[PDB]
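$ run holo --ligand "manganese (II) ion" --emit tokens
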Amino acid sequence: KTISFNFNQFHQNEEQLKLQRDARISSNSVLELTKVVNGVPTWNSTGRALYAKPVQVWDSTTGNVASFETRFSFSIRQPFPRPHPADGLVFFIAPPNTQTGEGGGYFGIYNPLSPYPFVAVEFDTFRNTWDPQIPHIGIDVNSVISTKTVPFTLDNGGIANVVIKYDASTKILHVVLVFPSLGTIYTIADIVDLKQVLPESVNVGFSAATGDPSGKQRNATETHDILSWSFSASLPG
Amino acid sequence: KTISFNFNQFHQNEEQLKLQRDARISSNSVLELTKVVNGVPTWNSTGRALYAKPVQVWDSTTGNVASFETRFSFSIRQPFPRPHPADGLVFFIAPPNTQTGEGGGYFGIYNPLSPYPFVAVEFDTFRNTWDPQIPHIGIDVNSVISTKTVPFTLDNGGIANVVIKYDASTKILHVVLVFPSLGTIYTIADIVDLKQVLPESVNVGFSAATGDPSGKQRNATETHDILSWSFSASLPG
Ligand SMILES: *[C@@H]1O[C@H](CO)[C@@H](O[C@@H]2O[C@H](CO)[C@@H](O)[C@H](O)[C@H]2NC(C)=O)[C@H](O[C@@H]2O[C@@H](C)[C@@H](O)[C@@H](O)[C@@H]2O)[C@H]1NC(C)=O
Ligand SMILES: *[C@@H]1O[C@H](CO)[C@@H](O[C@@H]2O[C@H](CO)[C@@H](O)[C@H](O)[C@H]2NC(C)=O)[C@H](O[C@@H]2O[C@@H](C)[C@@H](O)[C@@H](O)[C@@H]2O)[C@H]1NC(C)=O
Ligand SMILES: *[C@@H]1O[C@H](CO)[C@@H](O[C@@H]2O[C@H](CO)[C@@H](O)[C@H](O)[C@H]2NC(C)=O)[C@H](O[C@@H]2O[C@@H](C)[C@@H](O)[C@@H](O)[C@@H]2O)[C@H]1NC(C)=O
Ligand SMILES: *[C@@H]1O[C@H](CO)[C@@H](O[C@@H]2O[C@H](CO)[C@@H](O)[C@H](O)[C@H]2NC(C)=O)[C@H](O[C@@H]2O[C@@H](C)[C@@H](O)[C@@H](O)[C@@H]2O)[C@H]1NC(C)=O
Ligand SMILES: CC(=O)N[C@@H]1[C@@H](O)[C@@H](O)[C@@H](CO)O[C@@H]1O
Ligand SMILES: CC(=O)N[C@@H]1[C@@H](O)[C@@H](O)[C@@H](CO)O[C@@H]1O
Ligand SMILES: [Ca+2]
Ligand SMILES: [Ca+2]
Ligand SMILES: [Mn+2]
Ligand SMILES: [Mn+2]
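-- output --
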């Protein structure tokens, strides 16, 4: 089977999306994952957006795994440089019907009290105890402590283009990050066996989070906007 | 044992380069792999450019393999759309002291008579009997019949940015192609075991070719210019 969707922009009450927590669509078409009031990003915010319908990444009958490609544009504006912006956004794949997890450094996808598996590509802006210098792109498998990491310089408020591609034959998950205004290109890849970590049917989407209250810093925040998003998956068997 | 060089521009008679066949550096600093006379690309042309010093991709004593990253910008101008431009350019790695191979669809790196091993990333503009729709990026190992392929749309005469990265721990060779003027991004990756195909010391460089006379089409041509090039390899030990 081949499934695919495209979003050139977003409208209020998009029937193909599942918004959770602080996630919402602005009047001028952008998907704001985290809370922003009067043009100002708030702390203690967590939001997710999932594609309404589940997609099948693999079939147990034939044992075949799907190959997929996803592209999206996001923007992170960091109004308060000091002490430190937080926390970042991620593109992720998880079992269907999950609830928003812990916020802060966990981006809203990890729940210590009852963990569910997931594969995620993160754009980390805050340095937790388990993180290397930030910002950085990271490939996460069942944990927020990345298997592979690469540093990148953020184009504050600028637009970022991301291409995530997964080839089932080689099991290579490669992501590309581009800031057209700066002409900078960042690349990272790692081997991930989807069949080994996720169930046959999953949900795909984004999740982000701002500074957690425990950090005692209202300045630890930023925006996490998704401007556009296309997804395509192919399962031969 | 880290090695790296950077050519932000090309000078007449570069002491660090080895030009072969039709390859030459224009007065305005660009590296023209194939022949172009009076601003017009000729057919029956083949040229290569190798970094003068050999680089060590792996060490037999420790068994360790090098990781490397290379970035470059090229431009392909296609003056004659009909009947078909040809043939393309490639970035490649081969044993030191090799001679230009067959031209045409072989880009000047393959020699049926006496083949030598090589790993190359191709940007193919002509569709040979062994090729899929063109243009396409392709990863070649010891042969011009690609292991992995991805189609791309050329920005005629525009500038292209390429990022080729090889991670020895995962053996993943991933390349990224970007046409800044169109904002388009193309990505491809595959697993290649350098230690298994190439000798300890190799040469890195470019090779390109225009329409072969046997095709009986003088229009089967285009330019193959390299604007800038940086390389870097880290061999632990
Ligand atoms: C949180 O962000 C605020 C806005 O960026 C910081 O205040 C700004 O601090 C600038 C330099 O310290 C100063 O030039 C600006 O006028 C001021 N902006 C306003 C109107 O708040 C804030 O910095 C703290 O608060 C200011 C008022 C001073 O007390 C500074 O010494 C403080 O660092 C940031 N707070 C934190 C926790 O960093
Ligand atoms: C961070 O956001 C939380 C919700 O997104 C806040 O808790 C919410 O507080 C509301 C009170 O105004 C209450 O109706 C909601 O049920 C509750 N949500 C849940 C289930 O936690 C949380 O802090 C709360 O609100 C402040 C004003 C105090 O009333 C606290 O005691 C609450 O826990 C926010 N964290 C902070 C430190 O502001
Ligand atoms: C394609 O380019 C070739 C050069 O790499 C031409 O081959 C000829 O090679 C000879 C020895 O290697 C050399 O003396 C010639 O100068 C050169 N071509 C000439 C005459 O300039 C080849 O030219 C054709 O083939 C040669 C053997 C001669 O018969 C020429 O008259 C032919 O044009 C070029 N092919 C074509 C079809 O243009
Ligand atoms: C080889 O490239 C040439 C330049 O692009 C083509 O000639 C051009 O063809 C145009 C129509 O395709 C015509 O309007 C132009 O006047 C002409 N310009 C030149 C430089 O001659 C050429 O096209 C064929 O050959 C020429 C000589 C004409 O007879 C055209 O009508 C033919 O289509 C290209 N050759 C091929 C195989 O198309
Ligand atoms: C574990 C955890 O969520 N840690 C958070 C961190 O991610 C960030 O939100 C910070 C902001 O000041 O507050 C805490 O340290
Ligand atoms: C095998 C070979 O070199 N084939 C070439 C092809 O690569 C291209 O140059 C074409 C142009 O007319 O002429 C021939 O078919
Ligand atoms: Ca973090
Ligand atoms: Ca070809
Ligand atoms: Mn991280
Ligand atoms: Mn090819």
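-- notes --
Chain A touches chain B at residues 71, 161, 163, 165, 167, 170, 172, 174, 176, 178, 180, 183, 185, 187, 189-191 (CB under 8 Å).
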